[PDB]
């Protein structure tokens, strides 16, 4: 009961990207009620492994932070997207091409051109101007927010409980912004 708890699994928010408040795992339980002593000490020996795998997974994978389910993620702790700088091939450098038309030759069609020998091409940055904050994606929620195994559950002062397990709770208001 208190010692081998069925772990609190989270729920994903697709819109905000935050954690949608966790819930007790109620869809993987064995029905050990029809079992004598040689198996109900084996079933409890199984849950005591997934409550130890989930603690040796929470250290390898999750970011060490204070506020689990934070409302506003920082910039550096969110996966960014930095592709290669987009190498743009400029076709015809017009520093000597506008002289060709002013000589009288109208151009058409379209090295790269025969009248000019040179061909410059520029590169430019392909990332965003500012990195992204406020909300993690789906694969970040695959990575972080492993099911939190909560031992000796709800055993303390008010406010000392995990208040974000309530799937209605604002993390920076100490309150449900309810119907108003």
């Amino acid at each position: 009961s208190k010692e081998i708890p069925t772990p609190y699994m989270w729920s994903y928010q697709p819109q905000m990207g935050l954690a949608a408040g966790a819930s007790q795992d109620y869809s993987s339980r064995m029905n050990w009620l029809s079992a004598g002593p040689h198996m109900i000490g084996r079933v409890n020996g199984i849950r005591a492994t997934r409550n130890q795998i989930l603690l040796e997974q929470a250290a390898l994978t999750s970011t060490p932070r204070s506020q689990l389910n934070p409302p506003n993620w920082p910039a550096v702790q969110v996966y960014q997207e930095n592709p290669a700088p987009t190498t743009v091939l400029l076709p015809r450098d017009a520093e000597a091409e506008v002289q060709m038309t002013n000589s009288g030759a109208q151009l058409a069609g379209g090295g790269r051109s025969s009248f000019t020998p040179r061909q410059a091409y520029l590169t430019l940055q392909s990332s965003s101007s500012q990195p992204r904050s406020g909300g993690i994606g789906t694969l970040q929620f695959v990575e972080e927010f492993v099911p939190s195994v909560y031992f000796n559950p709800f055993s303390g002062a008010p406010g000392l409980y995990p208040d974000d397990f309530i799937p209605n709770y604002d993390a920076v208001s100490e309150s449900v912004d309810g119907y108003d």
């Binding site: 993987s28 064995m30 084996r42 199984i46 849950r47 492994t49 997934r50 795998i53 989930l54 997974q57 492993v146 099911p147």
Partner: protein
């Protein structure tokens, strides 16, 4: 995959080992030698898994897609079209489909 649940699976033989492996091989030599007689092999739960990699494309691909003719010839007896079937570098066919 997902070792968050894997010891909870393999005890109830969801994934893990087939009946050749987890049974003590005294019983595996017993049941296989006696199949005309008594025929164990039912009631021992052979599990199957799916290949968890190498099926799913996280890029937004497309299972099926119609193409559009880029010409037509309205002959009084014939009707000729040509198409432009083309793929995005990673989409093999069988062309019988």
């Amino acid at each position: 995959a997902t070792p968050s649940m894997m010891p909870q699976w393999s005890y109830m033989h969801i994934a893990g080992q087939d009946a050749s492996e987890y049974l003590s091989p005294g019983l595996v030599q017993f049941a296989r030698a006696t199949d005309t007689y008594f025929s164990l092999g039912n009631k021992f739960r052979n599990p199957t898994v799916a290949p968890t990699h190498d099926v799913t494309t996280d890029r937004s691909q497309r299972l099926t897609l119609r193409f559009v003719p880029v010409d037509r010839e309205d002959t009084a007896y014939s009707y000729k079209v040509r198409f432009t079937l083309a793929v995005g570098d990673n989409r093999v066919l069988d062309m019988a489909s």
